[PDB]
Amino acid sequence: TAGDGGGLVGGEGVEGSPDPIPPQLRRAVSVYEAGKALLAYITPDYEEIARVSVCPLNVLTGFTLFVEDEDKNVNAILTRSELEGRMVVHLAGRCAE
């Protein structure tokens, strides 16, 4: 949100953003985030989940907080298994919806 743009936040009252976030649009975010967290859980060696949230700060998305290990790839390494796992996890939400 920075100008006449906008379109992401969802609780301010003005025309662009509704007040109570319709329930049909909350079921969808729940489905999205459930699919993404389920895929991140059954993938071996992925980062670990600390917290899963739905519409934090009223934004119209989900959010999953991943904690990782800095003593395994010391801010520099990226194997191929990790990259393929990340691709799958990022498409999981679309597929579940």
């Binding site: 009252g13 003005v14 025309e15 662009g16 509704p18 007040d19 049909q24």
Partner: protein, 33 residues
Amino acid sequence: SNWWASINRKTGIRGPDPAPAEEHTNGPARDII
């Protein structure tokens, strides 16, 4: 079952449970705000 065998992206992707296509609408104005 094994419905996940007959998933086909040409004829549409769909799950087993029956199409929760429920919805509603007020006017365009009472939905913008």
